[PDB]
Each structure stands twice: as structure tokens, then as C-alpha cells.
Curated annotation (Swiss-Prot):
Segments forming domain RRM: 22-99
Name of the featured protein: Serine/arginine (SR)-type shuttling mRNA binding protein HRB1
Signal peptide boundaries: none
Note: Present with 1990 molecules/cell in log phase SD medium.
Top-level taxonomic group: Eukaryota
PTM characteristics: Methylated by HMT1.
Annotated compartments: Cytoplasm; Nucleus; Cytoplasm, P-body; Cytoplasm, Stress granule
Stated role: Binds to intron-containing transcripts and is involved in quality control for the export of spliced mRNAs from the nucleus. Binds to pre-mRNAs until splicing is completed or until faulty mRNAs are degraded. On correctly spliced mRNAs, GBP2 and HRB1 recruit MEX67 to allow nuclear export. On faulty mRNAs, GBP2 and HRB1 associate with the TRAMP complex that guides those pre-mRNAs to the exosome for degradation.
Annotated knockout phenotype: Sensitive to boron and hydrogen peroxide. Decreases cell population growth.
Length: 100
């Protein structure tokens, strides 16, 4: 199925600066980002299995995304590698996802 409540619950009740777990919360994304470009962006750390962009009214972006890496050690690379990178003219903000 192309669009599901799971994909919403993957960006809903999510906030940055969590305990160490394979899930990464990104913020300050440029407004032109798309899930296919987002997979290619975090794939240079190692490996994305589940990644997605939070939407506002329906399907319009927000500047927020979540990325599941293969393993918590790839998130530790991400937090020094993208947390610090100019994407679309924006210094991205990266951390472990605390999903409530």
C-alpha cells in the first residue's frame, strides 16, 4: 500500500535528542526534499530501510524527516555527517528520534 497510518506514525509524536536507537529524526530540511532524494542523502552513511518526510495539511512538506538506519552505529555516523551538512542552502539538524 502506497500511503498508510504507519508512515504517519513514523513522523507523528517524534522529537529530537533521544536515547541511542536506530531511528534518526532530522529537521531544518529544504522544502524541495522528497522521500527518494532523502533515501539517497542518508544512504552515504551506510543504509536506510525506512525513511519518510512529515507532512503539514495533507501531503505538503514541513522541514522534518525520520530515517531508520540498519543499526544504531550508522546513526552515530549520521549525527556527525549530516548534522553539519549544507543541503539545499540549509545546515541540517540531526539527532536520535525520541518517538513518544
Amino acid at each position: 500500500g502506497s500511503v498508510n497510518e504507519e508512515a504517519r506514525k513514523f513522523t507523528e509524536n517524534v522529537v529530537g535528542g533521544g536515547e541511542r536507537n536506530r531511528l534518526i529524526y532530522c529537521s531544518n530540511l529544504p522544502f524541495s526534499t522528497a522521500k527518494s532524494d532523502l533515501y539517497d542523502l542518508f544512504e552515504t552513511i551506510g543504509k536506510v530501510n525506512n525513511a519518510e518526510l512529515r507532512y503539514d495539511s495533507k501531503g505538503a512538506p514541513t522541514g522534518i524527516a525520520v530515517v531508520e538506519y540498519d543499526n544504531v552505529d550508522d546513526a552515530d555516523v549520521c549525527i556527525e555527517r549530516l548534522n553539519n551538512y549544507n543541503y539545499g542552502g540549509c545546515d541540517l539538524d540531526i539527532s536520535y528520534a525520541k518517538r513518544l
